[PDB]
Paper text:
PLA2-like proteins are catalytically inactive proteins due to some natural amino acid substitutions, including Asp49Lys and Tyr28Asn, leading to Ca+2 coordination inability. In this work, we studied the binding behaviour between MjTX-I, a myotoxic PLA2s-like isolated from Bothrops moojeni venom, and the suramin molecule using a broad combination of techniques, including myographic assays, molecular dynamic simulations, dynamic light scattering (DLS), small angle X-ray scattering (SAXS), isothermal titration calorimetry (ITC) and X-ray crystallography.
The MjTX-I/suramin crystal structure displays two toxin protomers that interact through one suramin molecule, leading to a PLA2-like compact dimeric assembly formation. Comparison of the monomers of native MjTX-I and the monomers of the toxin complexed with suramin yielded an average RMSD lower than 0.8 Å, revealing that ligand binding did not affect the tertiary structure of the protein. While the native MjTX-I crystal structure is composed of two dimers in an “extended assembly” that gives rise to a tetrameric array, the MjTX-I/suramin complex presents a dimeric “compact assembly”. The distances between Cβ from the residues (Leu122 and Phe125) were between 8–9 Å for both monomers. Thus, according to this classification, both monomers of MjTX-I/suramin are in the non-canonical conformation and are thus unable to interact with membranes. The first one is related to the natural substitution Arg118Asp from the MDoS region of the MjTX-I. The second is related to the binding of the suramin molecule that hides several basic residues, particularly Arg34, Lys49, Lys53, Lys69, and Lys70, which are related to the putative-MDoS suggested in the previous section. Thus, MjTX-I inhibition by the suramin may be related to two causes: (i) distortion of MDiS from both monomers impairing the membrane disruption mechanism by the toxin; and (ii) surface electrostatic changes of the complex that interfere with the toxin membrane dockage process (putative-MDoS is partially hidden).
Residue numbers in the entry:
A (entry chain B), B (entry chain A): 1 to 13, 15 to 53, 57 to 61, 67 to 88, 90 to 123, 125 to 127, 129 to 133
Amino acid sequence: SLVELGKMILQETGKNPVKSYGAYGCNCGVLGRGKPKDATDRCCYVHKCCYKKLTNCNPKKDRYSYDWKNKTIVCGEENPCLKQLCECDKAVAICLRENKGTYNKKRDVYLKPFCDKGRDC
Amino acid sequence: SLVELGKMILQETGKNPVKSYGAYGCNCGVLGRGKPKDATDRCCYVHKCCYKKLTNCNPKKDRYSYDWKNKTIVCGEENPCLKQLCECDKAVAICLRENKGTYNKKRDVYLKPFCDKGRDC
C-alpha cells in the first residue's frame, strides 16, 4: 500500500511522495496510466505495469514488511505476491531517485488534459 | 471527482487541499480509515464513510457539476449517485473549514503515524 510505497519514495528521494508524485505527469500517483512525458513519468509507467501483473494481492490496500539496511530497501519474505509487490515498489523508488535530475515542476496536477491513451502492458 | 473535491476544499478553507489535507492524520487524503486524531481528522473519516455508501459511480474519476452562489457550494442536479457524491464532497469541505481553529500541523504525513483501527462506518 501507500504506507510502504510512500515510505520507500521518501527514503530514496527525500521528497514528500503525496505532494511530489501524487499527480505527476500521466503515470505518477493515482488516475492510471498514459504515454509518459519524461523519465520520471516513465518510472511510474513501469511501476503501474508491474502492479497490473499482480492479481493474488491488492497493491492499494495490502501491507507488507521490509527493512532499511545499509541505506538500501531490503524486501522481506512475505508470500510471493507481497514479495513481488515489494519489489515493484522498491524499483520505482530507486528509479525516481535516479531521475531527480530532470524532475519538472510543470506537471503536478489532476486534469491530465494532454495525456494520450497508453499502450497495453 | 478528485478535481471537484480539491476545488471545494480550496474554496471553503482557502488552503492547498493536497499540501494541507493530502495526508492529515489517519483519514484525510491517503487511502484508508482509522481512529480520528482530532475534529479535522474526523471530517475526513465521515467523508470516507460517505463514499462507501455509493456503488453506482466512481468517486475518484467521475466528474460532476456544481456552482458557487452567495459564497456557497451548491450541487447541481445530476443523477442520484453523482448528486450524493457532490453532497459528500460539499460536507467535507465545510467541515474542514469549521475545524480550522484546531488544525494541528503535527499531523499532515502519510505513513499513518500509528493509527488505530477505525470504527465501522
